[PDB]
Design an enzyme around this catalytic site. Structure first.
Site, PDB file in Angstrom:
ATOM      1  N   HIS A 158       0.793  -1.239   0.000  1.00  0.00           N
ATOM      2  CA  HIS A 158       0.000   0.000   0.000  1.00  0.00           C
ATOM      3  C   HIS A 158       0.825   1.289   0.000  1.00  0.00           C
ATOM      4  O   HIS A 158       2.051   1.260  -0.026  1.00  0.00           O
ATOM      5  CB  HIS A 158      -0.970   0.003   1.184  1.00  0.00           C
ATOM      6  N   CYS A 165       4.397  -5.118   6.497  1.00  0.00           N
ATOM      7  CA  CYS A 165       3.821  -4.584   5.266  1.00  0.00           C
ATOM      8  C   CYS A 165       4.798  -3.883   4.307  1.00  0.00           C
ATOM      9  O   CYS A 165       5.892  -3.464   4.682  1.00  0.00           O
ATOM     10  CB  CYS A 165       2.683  -3.640   5.640  1.00  0.00           C
TER      11      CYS A 165
END
Length: 190
Positions: A158, A165
């Site tokens: 993202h 992440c």
């Protein structure tokens, strides 16, 4: 059984089916060149050995039921901790080697071979939701944009990023979001 009927997925997409040897025997993967793979565990899943062949019809037989899906382009992403990159290729040729933030030196992105599990345009991530206070260094409250789920365990595509992440610029995260489809291989390596 997933993927759904007719669904056109990427090439790292496993098939998921909801005595361990006994239900394995009642499932079989039928492909044009009889593609081989293995079972991984309730719910059991079947992973292709080096991926699916692109643009190939796959049908899954599980008991008295058969269902089938399609594979699309071979779009592959590779995340290097050491090169600090996310590199996206599609059918041999590379489209983009993108700078990436892969976890943090405390919790870097876990090595493995995965696939894009889902696409969400924006997603809010509150550490309080899984028991982590905001006053922690590994704590957060943010809205992730163009989030692609990598693992069940919370990696998203993202910089002090938590949960392992993968963080990209908005331009690159937007493109990969545009480029990627459910199933595509995401590879975490060196």
């Amino acid at each position: 059984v997933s993927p759904a009927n007719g669904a056109v997925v990427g090439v790292a997409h496993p098939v998921v089916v909801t005595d361990r040897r006994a239900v394995e025997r009642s499932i079989r993967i039928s492909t044009p060149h009889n593609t081989t793979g293995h079972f991984e565990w309730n719910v059991v899943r079947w992973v292709p050995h080096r991926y699916w062949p692109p643009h190939t019809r796959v049908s899954v037989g599980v008991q008295e039921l058969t269902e089938g899906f399609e594979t699309g382009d071979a779009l592959i992403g590779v995340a290097s901790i050491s090169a600090h990159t996310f590199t996206v290729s599609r059918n041999g040729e590379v489209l983009r080697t993108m700078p990436a933030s892969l976890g943090k030196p405390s919790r870097p992105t876990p090595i493995g071979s995965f696939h894009a599990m889902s696409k969400e345009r924006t997603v809010v991530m509150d550490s309080r939701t899984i028991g982590i206070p905001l006053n922690s260094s590994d704590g957060y409250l943010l809205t992730a944009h163009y989030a692609v789920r990598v693992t069940w365990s919370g990696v998203y595509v993202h910089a002090n990023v938590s949960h392992g992440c993968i963080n990209l610029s908005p331009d690159n995260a937007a493109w990969y979001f545009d480029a990627v489809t459910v199933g595509d291989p995401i590879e975490v390596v060196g």
